[PDB]
């Protein structure tokens, strides 16, 4: 279906210490597989996923030299962040870059993304059209004037645009067995007396990380009372997740957990 | 692959 | 803008063995400084790019050569022990600030020639 | 990777200029790049474009799907425009060649 290739950025400021830590992380849908550490013995993009580690050297030392200007850049910036909502120079903060290019199964440019956080707060975003900026903010509006006048929306177009899907493209075709993958749940129903009793919806080792799991009254859903934890990395590039009913003993073979994954071929019904 | 400046050098911001 | 890349001295004649430093500012708003050298006959060959205070690429530029920028965002590219082939045009570029993000800024140059 | 493009080139005023640029191994990630500058002079920016035929104010650049050349056109050159053009890739650094020498006469 859609595939995607996403870069995060993080950088944060330290009081006297020097110079912000840069970090950078690359994904290609819900897998991980490149890192950047500006704060690592030597700053040097890794390979986080086997079906990148075949890119020779040259990959290796462009990337990071990029990873590297990009640091200085995101440290510039944070001084002028600073200075535009009149923080001290002591204070430490956050700038936060999330950009990257979706595409459909013919593989040509579907959605393209660039957008900024300060704080964690949303501070500027690079609008669906791909030429103009949405500020969140007063000085929002200043960086917007800036870019508007150096025209860097074109440019941000220009990476979507070309760059950005001939790497996921190259990524898709060498990490396709992977990236391609759809590994249905594992799934299984647990129950734990109190005693109301609990209910417990089990799907484990999904990818990727989309999945549904409710729980039903006679075909009417719970949603009240299902307790439903975050879908979370097992470690090994798959995802888990639960939902929990407490109920009591009473009238238990109509309460049905139902599972959607785009690894199933059919909707799962489960009860214990 | 991530963003790099095609010939010049990055925003600010 | 308003002002370009502004490099001085305009030129310079000097004996081999010995030193010059060369003096740029970069074009209003930008923060990374480029030199470039062009031997008679050649294209541009990049020598050091620094981005605010901080080097952030080098060419194939010899040890003897040593680039700086200071805070104020001048650079100085001083060149030690000249011989014969170092007569050439240095050129001094700027981006990332009121320069577009691909493209780079010029100067007039500094002409060196190195006599013996 | 390298470019290869006419070491010179004659015209008249007034008429359109193409001077294209071979460039076999360009990579994912380079530009195609254009530049002028004139005898001792600081290069200029003219054009730059990645898949698509490029047109500005000064000049347009026409870019095959393979990549592998590229062509800058000069819409209606006069005296003025006798200068030496570059053809580059980029990525990070501006290599320059020898560029295409181009004297214009009347």
């Known amino acids: 279906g859609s595939h995607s290739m996403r870069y995060f950025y993080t950088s944060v400021s330290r009081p006297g210490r020097g110079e912000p830590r840069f970090i950078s992380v690359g994904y290609v849908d819900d897998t991980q597989f490149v890192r950047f550490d500006s704060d690592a013995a030597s700053p040097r993009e890794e390979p986080r996923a086997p079906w990148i580690e075949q890119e020779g050297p040259e990959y290796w030392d462009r990337n990071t030299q990029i990873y590297k200007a990009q640091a200085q850049t995101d440290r510039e910036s944070l001084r002028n962040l600073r200075g535009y909502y009149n923080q001290s120079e002591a204070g430490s903060h956050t700038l936060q870059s999330m950009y990257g290019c979706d595409v459909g199964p013919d593989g040509r440019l579907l959605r393209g993304h660039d957008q900024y956080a300060y704080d964690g707060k949303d501070y500027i975003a690079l609008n669906e059209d791909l030429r103009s900026w949405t500020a969140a903010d007063t000085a929002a509006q200043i960086t917007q004037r800036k870019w508007e006048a150096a025209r860097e929306a074109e440019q941000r177009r220009a990476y979507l645009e070309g760059e950005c899907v001939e790497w996921l493209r190259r990524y898709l075709e060498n990490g396709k067995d992977k990236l391609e993958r759809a590994d249905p749940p594992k799934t299984h129903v647990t129950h734990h007396p109190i005693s109301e009793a609990t209910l417990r919806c089990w799907a484990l080792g999904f990818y990727p990380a989309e999945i549904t799991l409710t729980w039903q009254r006679d075909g009417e859903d719970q949603t009240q009372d299902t307790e439903l934890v975050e879908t979370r990395p097992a470690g090994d590039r798959t995802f888990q997740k639960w939902a929990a009913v407490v109920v009591p003993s009473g009238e238990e073979q109509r309460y049905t957990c139902h599972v959607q994954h785009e690894g199933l071929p059919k909707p799962l019904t489960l009860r214990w | 692959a991530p963003r790099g400046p095609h010939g010049g050098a990055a925003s600010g911001l | 803008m308003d002002s370009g890349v502004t490099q001085t001295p305009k030129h310079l004649i000097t004996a081999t063995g010995q030193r010059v430093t060369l003096r740029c500012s970069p074009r209003?708003?930008?923060?990374?400084v480029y030199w470039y050298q062009q031997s008679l006959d050649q294209g541009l060959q990049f020598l050091i790019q620094?981005?605010?205070?901080?080097?952030?690429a080098k060419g194939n530029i010899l040890e003897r050569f040593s680039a700086q920028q200071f805070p104020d965002l001048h650079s100085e590219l001083n060149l030690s022990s000249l011989e014969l082939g170092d007569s050439a045009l240095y050129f001094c570029?700027?981006?990332?600030?009121?320069?577009?993000?691909?493209?780079?800024?010029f100067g007039p140059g500094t002409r060196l020639t190195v006599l013996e | 990777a390298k470019t290869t493009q006419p070491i010179s080139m004659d015209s008249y005023e007034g008429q359109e200029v193409n001077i294209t640029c071979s460039h076999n191994?360009?990579?994912?990630?380079?530009?195609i790049t254009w530049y002028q500058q004139f005898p001792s002079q600081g290069p200029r920016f003219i054009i730059q474009?990645?898949?698509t035929k490029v047109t500005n104010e000064v000049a347009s650049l026409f870019i095959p799907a393979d990549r592998k050349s590229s062509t800058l056109s000069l819409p209606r050159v006069s005296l003025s425009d006798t200068a030496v053009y570059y053809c580059?890739?980029?990525?990070?650094?501006?290599?320059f060649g020898t560029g295409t020498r181009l004297l214009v006469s009347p």
């Open positions: 570029a700027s981006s990332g600030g009121h320069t577009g993000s691909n493209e780079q800024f």
């Open positions: 209003s708003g930008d923060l990374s």
């Open positions: 620094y981005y605010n205070g901080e080097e952030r």
């Open positions: 191994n360009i990579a994912t990630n380079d530009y």
């Open positions: 474009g990645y898949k």
């Open positions: 580059l890739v980029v990525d990070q650094k501006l290599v």
